[PDB]
Amino acid sequence: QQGITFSKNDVEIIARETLYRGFFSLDLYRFRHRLFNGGMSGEITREIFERGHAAVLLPFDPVRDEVVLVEQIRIAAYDTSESPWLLEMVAGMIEAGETVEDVARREALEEAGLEVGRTKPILSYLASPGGTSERLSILVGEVDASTAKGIEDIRVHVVSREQAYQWVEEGKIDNAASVIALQWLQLHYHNLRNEWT
Amino acid sequence: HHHHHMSFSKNDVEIIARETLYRGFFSLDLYRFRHRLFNGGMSGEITREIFERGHAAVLLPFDPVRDEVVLVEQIRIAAYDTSESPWLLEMVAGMIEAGETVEDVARREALEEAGLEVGRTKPILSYLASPGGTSERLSILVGEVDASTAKGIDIRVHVVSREQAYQWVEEGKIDNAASVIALQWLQLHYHNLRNEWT
Ligand SMILES: Nc1ncnc2c1ncn2[C@@H]1O[C@H](COP(=O)(O)OP(=O)(O)O)[C@@H](O)[C@H]1O
Ligand SMILES: Nc1ncnc2c1ncn2[C@@H]1O[C@H](COP(=O)(O)OP(=O)(O)O)[C@@H](O)[C@H]1O
Ligand SMILES: [Mg+2]
């Protein structure tokens, strides 16, 4: 099939407004856009949670078939989870001029004590584009999982790939970045082990 | 050093306050809380801004006879700044109101967003979209559909092969969390799913 029909030049962002500015922002976009029927929308407003964008690293040890996870509290999980302490990927915000790879390698070293060898891109995704602009770009990084060490009150975990994926299936890992990375690993680990040996 | 799998509760968190920062269509709250530390003791009072927009039900519409998936296309303006286009190919989805089940919402949105009656369902998974800054949880089901009944009922409905939809995930043409998660799951499970549903 065709895939999507329209691009940026088919929408006019009339103006934006910051409704709240603190650590993060809440912005109001005012815009018009082309309709699938040909016409041009009326003026539309949407509230958009703006918090910058992130780099994510899945630390994979291809020799051991293990991943490294980081555990820490995410208070926003409280209301819909049995515990707000989550098992997650290495991640960090991307500041201006930084690259995904730079941030990913830096965070693996200081959150988990991991020197990263080769990296490969996994996927870059929008976390929830109806309400937030946030994009997260995921890499897989080559590590020796036996060297993992924890140093922002964080506990470092080493688990087999198979157990980490079973925990996705069971709901014990249930944050988007980790689910997406570990599903991708379940689809690609044979090729990745072949490539990284 | 690290905790190897082969070798805290909510009583360990004190939510002191939730302070309203913004109330409009969505909400922004300041959570003020304390929590137990891995090395013992409690943290001091910590504050976090949290985007509150409720929770959602997501349905991956899968025709197992035809090995096809139904996608819905619509503009998501928050995608603008980082995407080639703000029109996104997505799963059927809708907010869960109080007292509604994931299954009720998923089946309703499928019918109204895409004209699909849904047969059997299976859970895929339920995930937190971005738990450092938002409480939003999305619960995905796979739904059995007859893809030759999909019709747009501003939204455009696409019917594509599963292999095409998954190739679009690989290429980045589908890159929203819900659709990526659903379609990666389908790629891991379609062989057994198709057999169970035929
Ligand atoms: N980001 C937003 N800001 C303000 N209103 C919104 C926003 N997103 C959705 N809405 C409101 O909710 C309705 C449903 O929009 P849609 O995004 O298609 O559903 P959902 O948000 O449940 O996925 C719209 O008519 C709109 O008025
Ligand atoms: N939702 C938020 N509200 C307020 N501040 C935040 C939020 N998320 C991150 N920060 C700030 O960014 C810093 C690093 O964030 P991160 O490492 O992701 O979370 P934390 O270290 O608090 O578990 C924190 O010290 C905190 O001040
Ligand atoms: Mg970080």
Side-chain angles (χ1 to χ4, degrees), chain A residues 3-8 10-92 94-150 152-197, chain B residues 1-116 118-152 154-198:
Chain A
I4 63 158
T5 311
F6 295 122
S7 54
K8 291 178 131 214
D10 287 319
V11 58
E12 173 196 0
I13 286 180
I14 296 165
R16 312 185 191 195
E17 159 162 9
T18 301
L19 304 162
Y20 170 83
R21 174 102 180 180
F23 189 78
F24 298 138
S25 279
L26 187 70
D27 284 352
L28 191 79
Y29 293 38
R30 181 184 312 283
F31 63 103
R32 309 165 66 200
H33 65 87
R34 289 202 80 74
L35 308 169
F36 292 108
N37 103 278
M40 178 71 67
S41 74
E43 191 169 303
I44 308 309
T45 71
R46 291 290 179 264
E47 292 174 4
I48 300 310
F49 175 57
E50 302 267 14
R51 63 149 304 152
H53 310 293
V56 179
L57 186 99
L58 164 63
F60 178 57
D61 184 330
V63 181
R64 307 180 175 279
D65 202 21
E66 290 177 334
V67 297
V68 182
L69 307 174
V70 164
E71 185 188 2
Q72 65 195 103
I73 190 171
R74 300 290 176 186
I75 197 65
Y78 185 97
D79 282 340
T80 68
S81 314
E82 191 193 12
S83 173
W85 279 261
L86 305 190
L87 295 173
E88 299 187 305
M89 306 287 103
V90 170
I94 303 167
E95 284 145 323
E98 300 189 309
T99 73
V100 177
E101 193 180 341
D102 288 349
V103 170
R105 293 180 172 276
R106 185 188 70 210
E107 295 284 2
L109 194 72
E110 58 187 44
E111 281 187 343
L114 292 165
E115 221 89 41
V116 175
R118 297 162 275 191
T119 56
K120 287 171 69 78
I122 288 186
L123 297 163
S124 180
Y125 69 98
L126 298 160
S128 193
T132 183
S133 62
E134 185 184 22
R135 178 173 286 282
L136 300 91
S137 300
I138 312 169
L139 308 187
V140 60
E142 188 189 16
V143 302
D144 179 345
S146 76
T147 67
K149 38 186 182 302
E152 194 210 289
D153 182 42
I154 283 169
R155 185 120 90 183
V156 177
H157 295 262
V158 182
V159 303
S160 64
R161 168 192 56 70
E162 283 294 354
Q163 180 69 87
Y165 179 73
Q166 189 189 100
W167 281 348
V168 168
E169 292 225 288
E170 290 164 6
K172 169 155 176 168
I173 292 170
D174 74 344
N175 57 95
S178 298
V179 170
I180 289 166
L182 289 171
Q183 290 176 319
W184 177 98
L185 184 63
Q186 202 68 1
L187 288 165
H188 294 85
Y189 76 94
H190 285 300
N191 294 316
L192 195 54
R193 294 186 88 253
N194 290 327
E195 183 177 353
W196 283 354
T197 67
Chain B
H1 272 301
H2 59 259
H3 290 238
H4 203 282
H5 65 318
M6 294 199 182
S7 74
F8 291 142
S9 76
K10 291 177 169 180
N11 188 232
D12 297 310
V13 197
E14 165 193 329
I15 290 177
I16 294 155
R18 306 167 182 232
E19 296 168 7
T20 298
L21 297 170
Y22 173 85
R23 289 282 184 281
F25 185 83
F26 302 136
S27 304
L28 194 68
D29 288 337
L30 193 75
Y31 284 46
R32 186 178 304 273
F33 62 102
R34 301 175 69 145
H35 63 85
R36 189 137 265 106
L37 303 172
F38 285 113
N39 294 313
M42 298 288 294
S43 69
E45 298 189 3
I46 301 170
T47 67
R48 291 294 178 261
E49 298 176 359
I50 300 307
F51 180 52
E52 297 280 4
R53 62 155 300 160
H55 310 294
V58 177
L59 185 110
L60 166 63
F62 179 55
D63 181 332
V65 178
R66 298 183 176 112
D67 199 22
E68 292 176 355
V69 298
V70 185
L71 303 168
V72 295
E73 182 194 347
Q74 66 186 276
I75 189 170
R76 300 292 184 175
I77 199 64
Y80 183 89
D81 285 338
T82 69
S83 310
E84 198 181 338
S85 177
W87 279 263
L88 307 189
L89 298 165
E90 302 181 300
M91 313 275 97
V92 171
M95 203 195 59
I96 299 160
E97 287 96 334
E100 296 186 321
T101 62
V102 174
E103 186 97 19
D104 284 340
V105 179
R107 290 178 180 265
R108 180 180 67 235
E109 284 281 323
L111 190 53
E112 80 187 7
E113 235 166 44
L116 294 173
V118 179
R120 287 163 281 186
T121 56
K122 300 182 82 69
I124 289 182
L125 61 96
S126 172
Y127 69 95
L128 295 161
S130 192
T134 182
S135 64
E136 186 186 23
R137 175 171 290 277
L138 296 94
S139 300
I140 314 173
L141 308 174
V142 64
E144 180 184 24
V145 304
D146 168 7
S148 76
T149 65
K151 3 196 181 87
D154 194 44
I155 286 168
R156 171 150 158 183
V157 169
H158 304 261
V159 176
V160 307
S161 65
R162 166 188 58 70
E163 256 319 332
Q164 178 66 90
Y166 181 69
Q167 194 172 339
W168 281 341
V169 169
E170 297 176 299
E171 296 170 6
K173 293 203 184 85
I174 293 173
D175 72 348
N176 56 96
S179 297
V180 174
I181 291 173
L183 287 169
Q184 289 200 128
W185 176 98
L186 180 61
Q187 203 64 6
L188 287 155
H189 287 104
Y190 73 90
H191 179 85
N192 295 330
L193 191 55
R194 291 193 78 199
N195 284 324
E196 169 176 0
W197 280 356
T198 69

